[PDB]
Amino acid sequence: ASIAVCPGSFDPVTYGHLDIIKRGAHIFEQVYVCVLNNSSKKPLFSVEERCELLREVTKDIPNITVETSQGLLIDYARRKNAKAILRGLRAVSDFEYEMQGTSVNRVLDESIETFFMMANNQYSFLSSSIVKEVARYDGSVSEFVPPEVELALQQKFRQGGSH
Numbered sequence: 026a027s028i029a030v031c032p033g034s035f036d037p038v039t040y041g042h043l044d045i046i047k048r049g050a051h052i053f054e055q056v057y058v059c060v061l062n063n064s065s066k067k068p069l070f071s072v073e074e075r076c077e078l079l080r081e082v083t084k085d086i087p088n089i090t091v092e093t094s095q096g097l098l099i100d101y102a103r104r105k106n107a108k109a110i111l112r113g114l115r116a117v118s119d120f121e122y123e124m125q126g127t128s129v130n131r132v133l134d135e136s137i138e139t140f141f142m143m144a145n146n147q148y149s150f151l152s153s154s155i156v157k158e159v160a161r162y163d164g165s166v167s168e169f170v171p172p173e174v175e176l177a178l179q180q181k182f183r184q185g186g187s188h
């Protein structure tokens with residue numbers, strides 16, 4: 026089967042994430058975008074908000090299905106019958122954290138491979154963190170995220186919260 030999963034916290038999805046997602050969807054027949062709740066940090070948006078943003082920004086790409094999962098990414102991948110997990114590599118610093126993750130996944134299921142794509146174009150400088158900071162301080166994020174994400178950030182920062 027030509028099936029792959031693109032996991033991430035996507036908080037929020039940016040044009041850099043979307044480039045990885047579309048490149049993956051161009052290679053594989055079906056691509057599952059999985060919002061992983063997992064984290065070494067507290068997310069700005071909930072899982073459900075992140076999922077809906079993702080659905081809206083990829084609705085015209087037919088071989089993309091956006092879902093969220095309860096368990097391990099490696100079991101979600103098996104459930105989808107996916108043979109590859111796709112991740113982007115922006116900088117040299119993305120190295121070690123990605124290496125541990127793939128080392129663990131390889132032990133849990135060595136029949137599922139982790140493929141890294143380099144962010145090798147004009148979105149390489151961006152990150153979710155840079156977009157959230159800019160947004161929090163009233164800067165423009167239109168060159169960084171889809172219009173739907175820009176609006177969700179305006180809405181999120183108008184609400185009171187741990188931010």
Ligand SMILES: Nc1ncnc2c1ncn2[C@@H]1O[C@H](COP(=O)(O)OP(=O)(O)O)[C@@H](O)[C@H]1O
Pocket residue numbers: 032033034035036040041042044045061064111112113114115143144148149150151152153
């Ligand atoms: N600017 C970028 N350019 C290319 N690929 C990216 C970029 N940002 C993220 N990616 C890739 O897209 C996916 C999104 O990861 P992310 O949503 O930030 O959550 P997490 O790192 O917590 O799993 C990963 O494959 C990531 O490496």
Ligand SMILES: [Cl-]
Pocket residue numbers: 026027028052053
């Ligand atoms: Cl294939």
Ligand SMILES: [Mg+2]
Pocket residue numbers: 163164179
């Ligand atoms: Mg503003």
